Amino acid sequence: YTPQQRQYLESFIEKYVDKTKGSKQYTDETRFAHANNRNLSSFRSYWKEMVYPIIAERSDGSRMWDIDGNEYIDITMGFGVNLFGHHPSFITQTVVDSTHSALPPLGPMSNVAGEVADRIRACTGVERVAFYNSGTEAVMVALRLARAATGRTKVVVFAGSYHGTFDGVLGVANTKGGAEPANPLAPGIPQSFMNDLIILHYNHPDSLDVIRNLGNELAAVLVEPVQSRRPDLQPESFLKELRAITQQSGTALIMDEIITGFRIGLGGAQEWFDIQADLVTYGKIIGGGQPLGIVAGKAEFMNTIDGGTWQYGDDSYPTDEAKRTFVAGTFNTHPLTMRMSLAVLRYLQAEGETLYERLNQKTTYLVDQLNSYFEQSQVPIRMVQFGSLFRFVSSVDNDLFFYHLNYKGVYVWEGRNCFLSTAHTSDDIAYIIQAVQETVKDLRRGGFI
Amino acid sequence: YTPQQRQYLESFIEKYVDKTKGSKQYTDETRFAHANNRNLSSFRSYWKEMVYPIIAERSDGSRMWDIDGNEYIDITMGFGVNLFGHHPSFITQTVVDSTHSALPPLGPMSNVAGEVADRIRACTGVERVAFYNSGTEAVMVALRLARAATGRTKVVVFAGSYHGTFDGVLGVANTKGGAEPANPLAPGIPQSFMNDLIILHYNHPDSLDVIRNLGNELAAVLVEPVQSRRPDLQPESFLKELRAITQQSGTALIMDEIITGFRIGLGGAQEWFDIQADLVTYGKIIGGGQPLGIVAGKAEFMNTIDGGTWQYGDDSYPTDEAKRTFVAGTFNTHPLTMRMSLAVLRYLQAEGETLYERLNQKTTYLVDQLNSYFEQSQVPIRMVQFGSLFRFVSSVDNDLFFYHLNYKGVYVWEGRNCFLSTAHTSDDIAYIIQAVQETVKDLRRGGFI
Numbered sequence: 001y002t003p004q005q006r007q008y009l010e011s012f013i014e015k016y017v018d019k020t021k022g023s024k025q026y027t028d029e030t031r032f033a034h035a036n037n038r039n040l041s042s043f044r045s046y047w048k049e050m051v052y053p054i055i056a057e058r059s060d061g062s063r064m065w066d067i068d069g070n071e072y073i074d075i076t077m078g079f080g081v082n083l084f085g086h087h088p089s090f091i092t093q094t095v096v097d098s099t100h101s102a103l104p105p106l107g108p109m110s111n112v113a114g115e116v117a118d119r120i121r122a123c124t125g126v127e128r129v130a131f132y133n134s135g136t137e138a139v140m141v142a143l144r145l146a147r148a149a150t151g152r153t154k155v156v157v158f159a160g161s162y163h164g165t166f167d168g169v170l171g172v173a174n175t176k177g178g179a180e181p182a183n184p185l186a187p188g189i190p191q192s193f194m195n196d197l198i199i200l201h202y203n204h205p206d207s208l209d210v211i212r213n214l215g216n217e218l219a220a221v222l223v224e225p226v227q228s229r230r231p232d233l234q235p236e237s238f239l240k241e242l243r244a245i246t247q248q249s250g251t252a253l254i255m256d257e258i259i260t261g262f263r264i265g266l267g268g269a270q271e272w273f274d275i276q277a278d279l280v281t282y283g284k285i286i287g288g289g290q291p292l293g294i295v296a297g298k299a300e301f302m303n304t305i306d307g308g309t310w311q312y313g314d315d316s317y318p319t320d321e322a323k324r325t326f327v328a329g330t331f332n333t334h335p336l337t338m339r340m341s342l343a344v345l346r347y348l349q350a351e352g353e354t355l356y357e358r359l360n361q362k363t364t365y366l367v368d369q370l371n372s373y374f375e376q377s378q379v380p381i382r383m384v385q386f387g388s389l390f391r392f393v394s395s396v397d398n399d400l401f402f403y404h405l406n407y408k409g410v411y412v413w414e415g416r417n418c419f420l421s422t423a424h425t426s427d428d429i430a431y432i433i434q435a436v437q438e439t440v441k442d443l444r445r446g447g448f449i
Numbered sequence: 450y451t452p453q454q455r456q457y458l459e460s461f462i463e464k465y466v467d468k469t470k471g472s473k474q475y476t477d478e479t480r481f482a483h484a485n486n487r488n489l490s491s492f493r494s495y496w497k498e499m500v501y502p503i504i505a506e507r508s509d510g511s512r513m514w515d516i517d518g519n520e521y522i523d524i525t526m527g528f529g530v531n532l533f534g535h536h537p538s539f540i541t542q543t544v545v546d547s548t549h550s551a552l553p554p555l556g557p558m559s560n561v562a563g564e565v566a567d568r569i570r571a572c573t574g575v576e577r578v579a580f581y582n583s584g585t586e587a588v589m590v591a592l593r594l595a596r597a598a599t600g601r602t603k604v605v606v607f608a609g610s611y612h613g614t615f616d617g618v619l620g621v622a623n624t625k626g627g628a629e630p631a632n633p634l635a636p637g638i639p640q641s642f643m644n645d646l647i648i649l650h651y652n653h654p655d656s657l658d659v660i661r662n663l664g665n666e667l668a669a670v671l672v673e674p675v676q677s678r679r680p681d682l683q684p685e686s687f688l689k690e691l692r693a694i695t696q697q698s699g700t701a702l703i704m705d706e707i708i709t710g711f712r713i714g715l716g717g718a719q720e721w722f723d724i725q726a727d728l729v730t731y732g733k734i735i736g737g738g739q740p741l742g743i744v745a746g747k748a749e750f751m752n753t754i755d756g757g758t759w760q761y762g763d764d765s766y767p768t769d770e771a772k773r774t775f776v777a778g779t780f781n782t783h784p785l786t787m788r789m790s791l792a793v794l795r796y797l798q799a800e801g802e803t804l805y806e807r808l809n810q811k812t813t814y815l816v817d818q819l820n821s822y823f824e825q826s827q828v829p830i831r832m833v834q835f836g837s838l839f840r841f842v843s844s845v846d847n848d849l850f851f852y853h854l855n856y857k858g859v860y861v862w863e864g865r866n867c868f869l870s871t872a873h874t875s876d877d878i879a880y881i882i883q884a885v886q887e888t889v890k891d892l893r894r895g896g897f898i
């Protein structure tokens with residue numbers, strides 16, 4: 001740092017820590033007892049004094065309040081969960097109803113999950129629907145179903161995708177590239193968990209050749225249709241060709257829609273690109289704020305959950321029993337979660353396409369205004385977008401930029417996926433725009449352009 | 450079947466189906482759209498007309514009502530989640546509080562997880578606590594932490610244990626026993642996920658020899674201290690030796706307390722056997738009815754989550770950073786879940802040891818009564834027990850026996866782990882005994898002894 005930059009940083013740190021001193025003290029006091037990876041976010045030794053997560057006390061609509069009483073316009077929105085803002089009326093009413101109703105328990109099967117599955121079919125075109133406890137679990141199950149249905153083991157995923165924390169997806173590409181096995185992402189992940197994993201470049205044509213030439217050996221291609229980390233990469237022709245290749249080879253095309261599902265539109269990315277996957281994973285929005293992961297798709301693959309359907313009154317039996325895999329789960333189809341998922345689906349189906357048109361348009365406005373400002377002021381920042389997911393792209397110190405946004409009342413978690421919600425008003429969008437402009441001005445004054 | 454047995458079975462199926470015809474119809478009408486392995490429970494082609502799960506509509510205390518309006522004394526209790534029965538007052542109050550408080554959102558870190566971790570440390574003696582979304586996730590993380598801390602890969606589990614649905618624990622012992630690699634439990638689980646897994650006999654003294662002769666090669670021994678499947682096997686000496694062995698070899702002892710934790714007593718199986726593991730997994734009870742899985746244990750192993758603890762005001766830093774692994778999770782430390790967990794811990798800590806003494810004594814009474822009845826009536830059935838967990842062991846057709854119990858209004862899920870709760874009354878226990886005795890008398894009269 002130049003002296004001018006050092007002087008600015010020291011003054012900013014003092015004001016930042018004073019504003020969020022309670023989050024700092026809570027983090028330091030609980031760090032040992034409560035082990036959490038997020039207590040390392042953007043750690044650097046020379047500014048370790050402002051390296052701590054923001055601790056929340058309250059939320060409502062587009063707003064979050066921290067334990068220092070600071071108010072934020074929230075563009076984290078529960079990592080993408082809170083499409084409708086915090087505590088939408090129909091979610092709150094669902095919880096209120098559950099306190100008065102002698103809610104059925106875990107143990108017996110759910111009396112609501114059937115209608116949830118029906119409405120997911122109506123919204124998305126999937127054939128069969130299964131319920132688990134996180135997006136991570138849903139991805140793990142989806143891979144198992146593809147392998148069980150096909151009798152194969154090898155799976156392709158794309159570099160820069162995120163698919164949860166199942167060890168079988170936690171790899172990085174081989175030194176030699178191609179169809180060679182992955183290496184572990186981190187300590188504690190054994191090489192054996194990488195032997196059936198292949199990581200390829202997304203939207204590189206030669207990846208389509210590797211997959212084509214791998215052919216009948218691949219149990220699945222697992223794709224994040226729009227990768228959250230690069231919202232602007234929307235490779236329709238790559239995805240359509242991937243669909244044609246895997247269909248011909250009998251390989252499961254698994255689309256990870258844990259973010260794009262129920263966000264870009266009611267039918268998710270499948271509907272946006274008009275591509276029907278074999279298996280899809282859903283999560284985040286679809287639980288209504290409750291934890292949820294879903295695997296859904298074509299019977300040819302989903303039959304490995306129950307061995308396939310059959311009827312009463314005849315001699316039918318599960319015809320896919322020889323390919324049925326092992327699945328389970330204590331908290332599957334939780335009674336409150338199923339009622340919240342039902343409330344989300346009821347609301348989305350009643351509100352119709354205009355909900356998404358208005359929300360996507362509101363995000364396009366935010367992205368367009370900021371990109372014009374960056375161009376007008378010659379700032380090396382750019383907004384990228386897919387629907388109501390958006391991100392900042394910059395060569396300025398990203399960590400320093402986001403500390404300013406958070407300081408100015410715009411809450412951005414460390415992973416930096418940003419979302420608008422149906423609860424974000426015109427006033428809120430203007431506030432975000434102003435906070436970004438003041439941040440550019442401040443960093444310019446500090447010598448950080 | 451003899452004609453006596455055949456006619457009895459035909460009559461039983463007719464009355465069973467008539468009593469639960471709504472659950473049959475709901476299962477039939479939702480089977481395709483809602484894919485769920487539990488729909489295959491106790492399938493046999495010759496009695497398929499009564500093959501369907503019970504669909505629940507209501508619950509309260511020790512009771513559950515199905516969608517036909519039939520009332521049950523529930524001894525499934527959420528697969529062991531519901532230590533206090535359904536809707537204990539302090540849990541309902543937590544849900545009520547959450548609807549009028551503007552709960553903090555997902556996104557920012559939790560303002561309550563510190564106290565939850567502190568109380569778990571006070572209850573169990575663990576040093577550090579981390580929160581994930583299912584017991585399955587907790588076990589998967591715990592294995593990763595042990596592998597990261599030790600730099601080793603191979604893990605021992607014991608046959609007949611259950612540790613969730615992470616593919617890395619879903620194996621059967623090698624056809625040659627001993628220290629050979631496991632094989633997949635089911636289709637869809639690749640052999641690569643088995644190569645770092647070893648499956649040994651539980652409580653056989655030679656299993657400790659095989660572990661001994663493996664030396665420093667094991668990242669961990671994962672043990673279900675009492676296996677849910679065999680509650681009577683409580684091998685204290687075997688566990689004490691297993692602790693001493695792994696301690697000397699620097700191998701992680703991971704105790705899976707997802708069932709025994711907070712059930713046998715406040716400190717779990719660790720407190721019952723007076724053994725301190727390196728890592729422990731909790732789940733089920735500790736979420737208060739919300740989904741939850743926890744990995745906790747000694748800093749030497751838990752430090753792989755955040756790199757180890759540090760302080761503001763000095764030059765300290767994460768000192769285990771080279772061994773830090775990868776963990777994440779959208780729904781970690783969910784605001785409602787953390788508050789329910791806090792409510793469970795506060796209630797347990799206030800109520801004290803007599804809560805467990807009464808509940809364990811109640812279960813012992815039920816077990817002793819039934820075993821006395823079986824002995825006096827010369828019936829080949831026995832009860833086994835660990836605390837408030839109990840199971841039936843019988844050479845009589847188990848599925849037929851349990852169809853009778855369910856028909857008589859005692860709810861037993863297909864997995865047959867049974868539980869009492871603090872809500873089971875004197876009337877409830879007597880009705881459970883009566884249902885079992887009538888079941889034996891009906892079966893004897895039908896020719897099934």
Ligand SMILES: *Cc1c(COP(=O)(O)O)cnc(C)c1O
Nearest residue numbers: 134135136163164258259778779
């Ligand atoms: C968040 C996410 C996951 C993992 O979901 P969890 O519920 O956090 O396990 C997987 N895939 C994608 C695309 C996601 O955005």
Ligand SMILES: *Cc1c(COP(=O)(O)O)cnc(C)c1O
Nearest residue numbers: 329330583584585612613707708
């Ligand atoms: C239920 C259970 C698990 C898995 O827990 P889920 O929350 O269902 O994933 C793991 N281990 C043991 C001992 C259990 O009883």
